Amino acid sequence: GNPVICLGHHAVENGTSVKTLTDNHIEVVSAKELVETNHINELCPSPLKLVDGQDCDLINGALGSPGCDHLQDTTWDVFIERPTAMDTCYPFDVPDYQSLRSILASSGSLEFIAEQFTWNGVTVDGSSSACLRGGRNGFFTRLNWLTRVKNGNYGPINVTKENTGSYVRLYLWGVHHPSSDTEQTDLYKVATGRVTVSTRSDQISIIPNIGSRPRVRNQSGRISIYWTLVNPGDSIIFNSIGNLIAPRGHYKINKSTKGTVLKSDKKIGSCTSPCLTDKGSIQSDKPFQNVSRIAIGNCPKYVKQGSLMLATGMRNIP
Amino acid sequence: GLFGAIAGFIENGWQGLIDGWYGFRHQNAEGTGTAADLKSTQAAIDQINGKLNRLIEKTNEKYHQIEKEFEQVEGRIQDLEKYVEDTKIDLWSYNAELLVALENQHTIDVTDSEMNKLFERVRRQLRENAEDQGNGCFEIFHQCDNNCIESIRNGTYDHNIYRDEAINNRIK
């Protein structure tokens, strides 16, 4: 009957299974989950500054369509487009639509710097029944519809603006594509318009095209929206003999620096989370996640797996 | 494990060990009792916590990205915008799968090492006064009261004390 001293290790009744290099199912005492699979279902307004267009997409907000009155001068870290956003104004298309909405979303600002232009020899502030603001004919709040002098000519526009500031100016303008040769002559008196916006280093010129388009808001015509950037020291020139949709100023090109747009339908709650997704916010300390590939902020890295168990204990052998 | 102590010559674990990860379990004249071992338990936890902290450092923070969902076919550009994201997700998924499997293989080997570490420490303590039964227990060839047992567990056991009794009981 000699004394014996034994050496061992702890164990538990129900252990956790983990993967290793040499086995798919090894039971260990304790393990932590590294893949986050849950979300709040609401977008947390902290610490990221959010902006809800909530009836207006970003571009409609930049142009100033009826619904987007609340978006003026807004600043954001994340703009939020909704699926319920609706066009409300004269029908328009935007060549390279995703590029101009990704410039407005990076800049993270709808601050419109208003400027006074002198469109010599044209009627101004035209409105359309397809763009109603309070049951009344309106237009884009940041665009000026120019038509011929009342019973007169479309005096040739040669307006210029020099960028004196230290920032890059983003000008939003457009070109009206009439529906019939009557409308063209009824509005600008030329048989064929022309819009040429230019800087010293880049230019763009458009001659409109008459024809029938599907009726949108009882309108068969269209407005093609364009944009021109102006660097400090450069000058922009709006030259047109017809069909010009003039600007009312410019936007300020800001720095990306957590500025983007997220297309979601979830309500903005009162929570706090440094990570947003299209499916809501993520609150976790885990490295990975299977919530959504769309992730904005300090987020876990999106993976395909739904569970990756890291072993935090020895081999469990009861 | 690479050392074959846990799930090896140590048959199974002790569920009565709730105050530590590694422990002693003796049988002397006065009776029987179990005590955890702090040093071995702490060394294992430090290396698990150490690799846990390494895996949490929040380094991923992007805001402006490329679109990852599309409401109309476009062709060349959309194909690329998709293929770029798919390529990234696959690579990160591999980076995660390999990380977990590798860290676990190391984790299990670390805990199997610390168990053998403790055993080898006690082996060197007695060092002619006991013998390795094989199951992780030492047959102490001398009377070892509770004060003697504690001396083995807090590292003050002087083998020269019992060397004369122990060798005699072993050889004959």
């Epitope: 304790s30 | 709730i18 105050d19 990860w21 702490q42 430090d46 902290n53």
Partner: antibody, heavy 124, light 107 residues
């Protein structure tokens, strides 16, 4: 829900004895080791005593070794701090504290999760 | 023993300042440090265990750092209720050591 209640603190003369008690509630007391930590009034926290889960291994501070005696009871789930040979150095606000459980083990040597309200011991 | 040394011993700051505190010991106490909050007349509350692991329910502004030799308790955006005295704890081996206290006053 889970908390620790202290008691026993009174006014006592040097050289005599007292017994302070710490009743647990809302957790498996007999599974955790436990600690007594005293905040000398004016100074910071000063660990004084600690005991294992079973009660066979007891750890004391060098200032109270052979003078104070810790003990516990599974049947009442209570922690006893039997103080003998008191002196004004031992004047302090006594706290019974619970070392944190880590991973799966209820270690005795860790940070302290739960504290009692604080029962003051005055020695004139 | 192991001797802890909190620096500074006291500090005054306004709400919203980047507060930094240090715990400083002798031995290799690996990663065993526990920071505590303490209001006057009240028992401590565990803020950080493992010297970096945030305690459950504690706001994310409290953060801990350090390993082995040099330790640090950082607070990003101080709040009115965060006015308190702070203690660090050694937990590598017995006996348990605490610090001299680092109180945050009003500026």
């Amino acid at each position: 829900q889970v908390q620790l209640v202290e008691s026993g603190g009174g006014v006592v003369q040097p050289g005599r004895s007292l017994r302070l008690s710490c009743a647990a509630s809302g957790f498996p007391f007999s599974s955790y080791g436990m600690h007594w930590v005293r905040q000398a009034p004016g100074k910071g926290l000063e660990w004084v005593a600690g005991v294992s889960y079973d009660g066979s291994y007891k750890y004391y501070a060098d200032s109270v070794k052979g003078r104070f005696t810790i003990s516990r009871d599974s049947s009442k789930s209570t922690l006893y701090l039997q103080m003998n040979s008191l002196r004004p150095e031992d004047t302090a606000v006594y706290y019974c504290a619970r070392p944190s459980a880590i991973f799966g083990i209820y270690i005795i040597l860790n940070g302290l999760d739960v504290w009692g309200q604080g029962t003051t011991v005055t020695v004139s | 023993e192991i001797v802890l040394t909190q620096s500074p011993s006291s500090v005054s700051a306004s709400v919203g300042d980047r507060v930094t505190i240090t715990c400083r010991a002798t031995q290799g106490i690996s990663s065993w440090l526990a920071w505590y909050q303490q209001k006057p007349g009240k028992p401590p509350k565990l803020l950080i265990f493992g010297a970096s692991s945030l305690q459950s329910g504690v706001p994310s502004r409290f953060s801990g750092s350090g390993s082995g030799t040099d330790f640090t308790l950082t607070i990003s955006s101080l709040q009115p209720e965060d006015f308190a005295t702070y203690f660090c704890q050694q937990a590598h081996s017995f006996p348990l050591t605490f610090g001299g206290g680092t109180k945050v006053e009003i500026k």
